[PDB]
Nucleic acid binder design. Sequence first.
DNA 1: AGACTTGTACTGGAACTCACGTGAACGAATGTTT
DNA 2: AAACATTCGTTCACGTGAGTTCCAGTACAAGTCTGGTC
Lengths: 24, 244, 51, 51, 46
Amino acid sequence: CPGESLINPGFKSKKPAGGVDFDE
Amino acid sequence: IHWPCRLTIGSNLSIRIAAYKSILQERVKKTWTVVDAKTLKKEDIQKETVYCLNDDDETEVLKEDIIQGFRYGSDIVPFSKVDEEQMKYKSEGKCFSVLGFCKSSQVQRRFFMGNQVLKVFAARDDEAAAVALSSLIHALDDLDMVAIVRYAYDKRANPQVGVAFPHIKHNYECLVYVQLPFMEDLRQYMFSSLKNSKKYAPTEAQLNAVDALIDSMSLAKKDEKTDTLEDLFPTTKIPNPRFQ
Amino acid sequence: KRALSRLKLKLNKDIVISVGIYNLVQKALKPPPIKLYRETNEPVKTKTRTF
Amino acid sequence: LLKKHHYLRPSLFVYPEESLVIGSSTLFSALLIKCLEKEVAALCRYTPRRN
Amino acid sequence: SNIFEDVEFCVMSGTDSQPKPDLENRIAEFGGYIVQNPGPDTYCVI
DNA sequence: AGACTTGTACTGGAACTCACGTGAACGAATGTTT
DNA sequence: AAACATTCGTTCACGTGAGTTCCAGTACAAGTCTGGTC
């Protein structure tokens, strides 16, 4: 399934923590 | 007890605030004290803990002879308390900082964490702080926004990321702070859908029956369809049965 | 995935449906420390008693 | 009638099991659909463990 | 031999020529108390 | 006969979670000293 | 009359016992393959 992690199958792949990024 | 601090937006803006704990789970002020069966005195009993090795002879190791270690996969990594204190994450305490402002829709109610709710007021006997906080609250309410903030009770308290949202009432207005989750506390579980399931789809008669059940068991009543609603079973006003 | 508990929701004294309770947000704690022997560096078993 | 500032404990998730009582999934789905339609929440008394 | 006697040695690094366990064995050959971590009774760390 | 493989059931331990206890630390009020 | 020390109720973090779910080890029984002779 798209978005499945390549390290731990069966778990959603967490996007990297980006913190606060102000919008334009 | 009031908690004083400064709400900071950058390094130039600072508003003096006082925080109180509004809602928290309440426990018994006193605890059961274990007393001797016959003498009924607390002085007559004593509790202590002893550590012994896993060898057959069952050696005795004193309290000063133990060092704390952790587990790294299939091994054990010694990590003394002093070394941990040296390497521990150090922070500057008593922070109420505004990381940012975000739309209310983005902060859902099912992600709230923690065991407390804080109410943030302006500092006592300070007109300027009151005006500043009122300005911020009204701006957030008009824009339909909340403030994502960093919170640390003291130097040794782990920093937290939470949401402060406005709360305006006729008598008083205040910010309400509730904790928010880190990345580590989120659980990614997948559940089967119920709308698309073929074998669990209810029929129309079942839906009508459940509609009748919901209608019959309503716990609120409209005031003659005139002004507003009224609650028939207000649970917030029921004392806790445990203490009774 | 693991169910905290499996309970019975009772609409009445006769209508009961089985449900499961899960937690979608759980606080993350450091793994608990384990005591170790300073000399040989092997785990030590702990016990408590009252007298 | 549910207040957002009346937070006391982290929330949980209730999902039908179907392994203990057969026919619970259908009633759970009907309750879900009608509750969403009427914008109501089921008030209940909860006891996780004995005592 | 009985050169070292009732001394706590706590070695946590060894040279490439002398790996940690090898040095542990050599020092233990002379009657030294090996301690995998230092402490109040530790005489010297290596 | 005998030995291994497969299927069913049971029991104990690991892991996870919550409740309860203990320890240390602290702002504000009060008492004491100068 | 003013400054400093002590005490008190509060707060947080960390540790330990009991309940629940899941999986591995164990036991037993049946099935399958084999051996030998008359």
